[PDB]
Design goal:
Blueprint (H helix, E strand, L loop, with lengths): L5 E5 L6 H15 L2 E5 L4 H9 L7 E5 L3 H6 L10 H4 L4 H6 L1 E2 L2 E2 L2 E6 L2 E5 L13 H10 L3 E3 L6 H10 L3 E6 L2 E8 L3 H15 L9 H9 L3 E6 L14 E4 L3 E2 L2 E2 L3 E9 L6 H12 L2 H10 L4 E2 L2 H7 L3 H12 L1 E2 L6 H17 L4 H13 L1
Parallel strand pairs: 1-2, 1-3, 8-11, 15-17
Antiparallel strand pairs: 3-15, 4-5, 6-15, 6-16, 7-11, 7-12, 9-10, 13-14
Helix pairs in contact: 1-11, 7-8, 14-15
Bound molecules: sodium ion (6 copies).
């Protein structure tokens, strides 16, 4: 079914697949084994279909959170890196690729939101959320605003909501406790209260969405936004001299953005598991391998320490990794699907006044733990 003696790799069409193919060509030169890199449409839908019948690629690349469902269906091989190899990657990245206590993928790259700021409006960006109200008053007096970011989606508001002690699900022992949910605790209530107050006191509008925040920042109307590495290429550097830094703290605690870890899984049905391990450990997860992919399409921050130390000479990448290290690995369990919709509703209702902050989060907590 899956052909022995070659590697077929699937990766999304927004990634550096020409760079990956060059890594494959080096592997083929050293081993005589053909590597075929493909970027099919809807690969994350296709993989569980073909893998369920014992078919598909030998290696799949995707964000780690989707691999939980794949691992629940036994579609991914348990990987076997030795302890010395594991020590070459930042330890938090291995946690992202554990399911039911077992390692099911190799971490490649790390993504998280950062604070993006306009250096000509704000050469010294605020280190705390608590400073932002006063800063907004000063900037509004000069015809600008302090901060605009997407308020409609919990991915973007969670960093603040969770800073003072919120969390989705408690992680321990390579597993999550589905009964230990941090959506209606004191810290979450404090952060959502602070967000709602930003709106009540006219520092942000409740209808601000992704489009508005991006346009406002690119036009030089707002000093700051919150966004991820996918947004950098769109920032009009002709008009905006921007920096990227650590997110502000709240009550002295770091903001807690969700962390996505681009990961490489090995099909459980592959007869090429040793070749796949060799390719991933000793060709891709090297400075030269990650450089080839990154040159094609930037990976952002990477899990491999040796190469991250080079990439972090770019302060935007250094900030991405700092915010990731302080953030919350996105849980890979099925109960996380309940989290997104429950918290989305809670934030919308609190920002509109439909619900008090406490009731909004209480209702979300009840749905997530149900
Ligand atoms: Na070839
Ligand atoms: Na090839
Ligand atoms: Na084999
Ligand atoms: Na080092
Ligand atoms: Na170098
Ligand atoms: Na509760």
């Amino acid at each position: 079914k899956i052909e022995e003696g070659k590697l077929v790799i699937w990766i999304n069409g927004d990634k550096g697949y020409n760079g990956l193919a060059e890594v494959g060509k080096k592997f083929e030169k050293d081993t005589g084994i053909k590597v075929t890199v493909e970027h099919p449409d809807k690969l994350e839908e296709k993989f569980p279909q073909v893998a369920a019948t014992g078919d598909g690629p030998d290696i799949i690349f995707w964000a780690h959170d989707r691999f939980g469902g794949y691992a629940q269906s036994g579609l991914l091989a348990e990987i076997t890196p030795d302890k010395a190899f594991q020590d070459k990657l930042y330890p938090f990245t291995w946690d992202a690729v554990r399911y039911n206590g077992k390692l099911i993928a190799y971490p490649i790259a790390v993504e998280a939101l950062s604070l993006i700021y306009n250096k000509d409006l704000l050469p010294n960006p605020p280190k705390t959320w608590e400073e932002i109200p006063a800063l907004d008053k000063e900037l509004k007096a000069k015809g600008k605003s302090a901060l605009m970011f997407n308020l409609q989606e919990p991915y973007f508001t969670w960093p603040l909501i969770a800073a003072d002690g919120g969390y989705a699900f408690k992680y321990e022992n390579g597993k999550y406790d589905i009964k230990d949910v941090g959506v209606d605790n004191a810290g979450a209530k404090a952060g959502l209260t602070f967000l709602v107050d930003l709106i009540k006191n006219k520092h942000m509008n409740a209808d601000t969405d992704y489009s508005i925040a991006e346009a406002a920042f690119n036009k030089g109307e707002t000093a700051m936004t919150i966004n991820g590495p996918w947004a950098w290429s769109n920032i009009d550097t002709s008009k905006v001299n921007y920096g990227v830094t650590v997110l502000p703290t709240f009550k002295g605690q770091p903001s807690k953005p969700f962390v996505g870890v681009l990961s490489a899984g090995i099909n459980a049905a592959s007869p090429n598991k040793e070749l796949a391990k060799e390719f991933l450990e000793n060709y891709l997860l090297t400075d030269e391998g990650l450089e080839a992919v990154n040159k094609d399409k930037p990976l952002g921050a990477v899990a491999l320490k040796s190469y991250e130390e080079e990439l972090a000479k770019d302060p935007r990448i250094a900030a991405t990794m700092e915010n990731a290290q302080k953030g919350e690995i996105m849980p890979n369990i099925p109960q996380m699907s309940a989290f997104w919709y429950a918290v989305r509703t809670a934030v919308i209702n609190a920002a509109s006044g439909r619900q008090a902050v406490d009731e909004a989060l209480k209702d979300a907590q009840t749905r997530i733990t149900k």
